Structure 1
Amino acid sequence: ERFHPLLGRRVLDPAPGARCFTGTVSSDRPAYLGEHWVYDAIVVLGVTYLEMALAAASRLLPGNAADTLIVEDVTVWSPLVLRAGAPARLRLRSEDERFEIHSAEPERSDDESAWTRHATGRIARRQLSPDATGQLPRLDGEAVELDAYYERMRIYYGPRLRNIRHLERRGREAIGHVCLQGEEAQESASYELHPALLDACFQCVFALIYAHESHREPFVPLGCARIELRARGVREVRVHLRLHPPRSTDHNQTHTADLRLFDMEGRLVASVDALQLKRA
């Protein structure tokens, strides 16, 4: 059995054909779980659930080390609110490649009713495609002022989650350069795709949006059509993103974006199709 900071370990499931993982987390461990806030409450980032699903795809589905890991048709349901230092049990159950993720207070977790649903979707695994993928395009865009973005966003994100080092935009497209630091970079090979690194890619989308719209009632990921992970344990990527055309030119309740992550050398690391954003 392969250790994972969020999934935990396999445990018996009550359903005959289901496979289950449970682990304990807290705002202190993984530490990035204590560094995203909404209205003075510690709120677990939705990228947490995407990493758990990829980690389950790796461990539930046999294959080659270089296989592509896939999560599809993902919906994020309730937020997970942590109280500082108080442990939460996290659970991923899967049957016939469908998964669901729940959390519970550890002392109450014997009752299925104590478990709150956070994410659902499908997992899969495919051999690495030999097809040419494409490269990071030369956008020759306008630099986005990241110091202004970070000052705006400091109410939601602490120091471990300020990992965008450069961002340039042209229309609704942008290229970001994101890099883990400190402990997160140290631990990046424990993850399929470190949540702090994928959050940084998503914040590149936010930074594009917040160059035009208000950052109050901020956009929150609600799901995505597909994520494909082609290399595991990465620490630094350049990300190409594209926002779909918005309903409004002034202020939107929703946005949709596609993203491609490339390693520093230029190979495609991950794809995200139709990330759905909605204002909280």
Structure 2
Amino acid sequence: ERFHPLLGRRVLDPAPGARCFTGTVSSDRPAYLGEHWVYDAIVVPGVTYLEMALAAASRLLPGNAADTLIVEDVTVWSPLVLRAGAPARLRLRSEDERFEIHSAEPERSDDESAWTRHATGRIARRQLSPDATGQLPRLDGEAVELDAYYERMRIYYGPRLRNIRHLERRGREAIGHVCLQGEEAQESASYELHPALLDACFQCVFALIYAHESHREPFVPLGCARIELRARGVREVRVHLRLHPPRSTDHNQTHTADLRLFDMEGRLVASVDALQLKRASKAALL
């Protein structure tokens, strides 16, 4: 059995059609979980659940290694607040093509009534047509000032989650270069798509958005229409992203974006269709 740092192990579930995983996480392990905050609280980023779902597709659905892993119609909510160092159980349950992800205290607080739901969606996998190299589009534009972006975002992200090396924009489109180093690089093959790398791609979208509106009350992923993953355990990509035209010119409650991640030879690694972003209120978090 192939274990996973977030999914954990297969566990029996009383529901007969169901297949289930459970694992323990804490802000110390995976270590990236201790470096993301909203309103000064440690909060598990939604890319965590996207990786759990990809990892489930890999393990539950039959196929060749070259098959594309697909997460569809995925909604995230109810931010999981971690107390530093205190373990939390994460559980992914799958029935037919659907999954749900819940968390609970280890000791529990009512057995099954003690689980809080964080994510739902569908998983799939398909043998898609071969991916050629050299497919990253050209974009000559203006370099985004990333030092000033990182300085603003240090209230949400620690040094483990500053992985954008360069970001060039032309209107609402951009190309970013994202590279992991350190522990995240070393452990990237344990993941289908390391959450720190996917988060860095989503931060390229934030960097476009925050050039024109405030980074306070931050946009958080709410879900996406589709994720397709064509290669696993990558640690370095170039990402092409497109922000949809916003409703307002100065301050929005929501945004939508599409992303396409490429390896350094320009073969497509992943696609994210219609990522939905929504500003998070502090109310009720703490």
Write the distance in 2 (CA, Å) between the matches of 1:40 and 1:144.
26
1:133 is displaced (CA, Å) by 8.8
TM-fit CA distance, 1:137? 1.3
Deviant stretches of 4+, over 4 Å = 131-134
User: C-alpha offsets along residues 153-181 of structure 1, whole Å, 9 cap, x if unaligned?
Assistant: 00000010000000000000000000001
Quote the Cα distance in structure 2 between the aligned partners of 1:186 and 1:131.
26
Deviation at 1:134, TM superposition (A): 7.6
Q: Report the Cα offset of residue 68 of structure 1.
A: 0.3
Conservation of the 8 A alpha-carbon contact between 2:6 and 2:24? yes
* Deviation sequence 1:98-129 (CA, Å, 0-9, x none): 00000000001661111000000000000132
Q: Give the CA RMSD over aligned residues.
A: 1.1
Alignment coverage as a number of residue pairs: 279
C-alpha displacement of 1:3: 1.0
Partners of 2:72 and 2:169 in 1: CA distance: 28
| Partner SS for 1:201 | helix
Distance across 1 between alignment mates of 2:27 and 2:195: 14
What 5-or-longer segments of structure 1 have no aligned partner? none
Paired residue secondary structure (2:20): strand
Query: 1: distance between equivalents of 2:101 and 2:44?
Result: 13
- The DSSP-based 3-state class of the residue aligned with 1:168 is strand
Q: How many angstroms does 1:136 deviate by?
A: 1.4
Task: Label 1:251 to 1:270 Cα distance change in 2 as closer, same or farther (>3 A).
Answer: same
C-alpha distance 196-114 of structure 1, shift in aligned 2 (>3 A) = same
Q: Secondary structure at the match of 1:14?
A: coil
Q: Give 1:40 deviation, angstroms.
A: 1.4
Distance 1:163 1:16, change over 3 A: same
CA distance in 2, matches of 1:109, 1:31: 26
1:1-280 superposed matches below 5 A: 1-108=1-108, 111-130=111-130, 135-279=135-279
Query: Contact 2:131–2:267 at 8 Å: present in 1 too?
Result: no
TM-superposed deviation, 1:145: 0.2
Q: Does structure 1 retain, via aligned residues, the 8 Å contact 2:133–2:266?
A: no
Say whether the 8 Å CA contact 2:132–2:267 is kept in structure 1: no
CA distance in 2, matches of 1:150, 1:102: 31
| Cα offset, 1:130, TM superposition | 3.1
CA distance in 2, matches of 1:213, 1:237: 27
User: How many angstroms apart in 2 are the aligned matches of 1:101 and 1:201?
Assistant: 23
Identical residues among aligned pairs (%):
100
In the alignment, the residues of structure 1 paired with residue 109 and residue 17 of structure 2 have an alpha-carbon distance, to the nearest angstrom, of 21
Which deviates more from structure 2 when the two are superposed, residues 220-229 or residues 120-129?
120-129
Query: 2 CA distance for matches of 1:63 and 1:110?
Result: 38
Deviation per residue, 1:67-88 (Å, 9 max, x gap):
1000000000211110000000
Secondary structure of the structure 1 residue equivalent to 2:107 = helix
Deviation at 1:16, TM superposition (A): 1.0
SS in 2 for 1:137: coil
- C-alpha separation between the residues in 2 aligned to 1:117 and 1:188? 27
Classify 1:54/1:109 alpha carbon distance in 2 versus 1 (closer, same or farther; 3 Å): farther
Q: Give me the TM-score of the superposition, normalised by structure 1.
A: 0.98
